[PDB]
Paper text:
The programmed death 1 (PD-1) receptor and its ligand PD-L1 have become an important target in cancer immunotherapy. Overexpression of membrane bound PD-L1 by tumor cells attenuates T-cell signaling to evade immune surveillance due to its binding with T-cell membrane bound PD-1. However, the immunosuppressive conditions can be reversed by blocking the interaction of PD-1 and PD-L1 and restoring the activity of the body's immune cells to kill tumor cells. A promising alternative approach involves the use of small molecules acting as PD-1/PD-L1 antagonists to stimulate PD-L1 dimerization.
As part of our continuing research towards small molecules that antagonize PD-1/PDL-1, we present here the synthesis, biological activity, and structural basis of 1,5-disubstituted tetrazoles as PD-1/PD-L1 antagonists. The electron density well explains the inhibitor structure and its interactions with the PD-L1 chains. Compound 10f interacts with PD-L1 through a series of hydrophobic interactions and hydrogen bonds in accordance with our modelling studies. The biphenyl moiety is stabilized between both PD-L1 subunits via hydrophobic interactions with APD-L1 Tyr56, Met115 and Tyr123 as well as BPD-L1 Ala121, Met115 and Ile54, all well-known from previously reported similar co-structures. The tetrazole moiety likely not only increases the solubility of compound 10f, but also provides additional interaction via hydrogen bonds with the APhe19 carbonyl backbone and ATyr123 nitrogen as well as BGln66 side chain amine further stabilizing the inhibitor and enhancing its affinity towards PD-L1. No aliphatic side chain but hydrogen at the α-position led to active compound 10f. To confirm the dimerization of the PD-L1 complex, molecules 10f, 10l and 10p were tested for the interaction with human PD-L1(hPD-L1) using a 1H NMR titration experiment and showed protein oligomerization upon addition of the ligand at the molar ratio of protein to inhibitor equal to 1 : 1, which is indicated as broadening of the hPD-L1 proton signals in the spectra. The corresponding behaviour is characteristic of hPD-L1 oligomerization, previously observed by our group with BMS reference compounds.
Numbering used by the authors:
A (entry chain B): 4 to 121
B (entry chain A): 4 to 120
Amino acid sequence: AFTVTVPKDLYVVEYGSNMTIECKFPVEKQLDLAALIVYWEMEDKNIIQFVHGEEDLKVQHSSYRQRARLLKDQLSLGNAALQITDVKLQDAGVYRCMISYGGADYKRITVKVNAPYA
Amino acid sequence: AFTVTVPKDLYVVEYGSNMTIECKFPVEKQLDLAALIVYWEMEDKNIIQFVHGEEDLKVQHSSYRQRARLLKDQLSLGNAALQITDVKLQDAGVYRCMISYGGADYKRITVKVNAPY
Ligand SMILES: CCNCc1nnnn1/C=C/c1cccc(-c2ccccc2)c1C
């Protein structure tokens, strides 16, 4: 169980930059993939669905296609790290990470996107 | 595998009646309390937190204090049944059941409240 903990509740980013938003969870030794579920969401649009190690491209929302990815490397450290490359204005909003790894919690994260200033 | 399934996505209810909204989940005739978590929420108000056998009373928001309860009887049958008694207009809105039982899924249910005159 415990609690999902978030380093930063707000990320302010540049248009066309990259960002990695993070949700930490209690890990403790190795990662038992059978126990792990990570869902990232915003505005009820599926960004990531990780289910015991399974991800399907097809479930992802098109706006996030080929840009958002979950850094599997950080998962073993108890860090659900969503990385979105080439941040779009439309990506501004509230993100929900939902994690289960022997008990479950969710946190909300806000994103503000600065204009490109053409 | 794990998918939360809802009989009714909308409930239209009477003011001052009771309602019971339900979220079904896969149980294999097993029903391991230690594994099960049920969170009911609406408009970011915690209604129920069933955690590992017990209802957590403390975290329930005081608007749903003596009114919302989880039907424990149904849980064994893979049915997270939130019952709220004496429905107020304020109880109209979108409910989110989050269930974790060896894997995890959520669904939204909308509630519309009638009062005839
Ligand atoms: C359909 C395939 N299954 C995966 C899936 N699909 N939609 N959502 N989802 C997973 C959701 C999830 C994942 C982890 C924890 C919690 C959760 C549980 C209780 C409290 C807080 C958070 C939830 C609700």
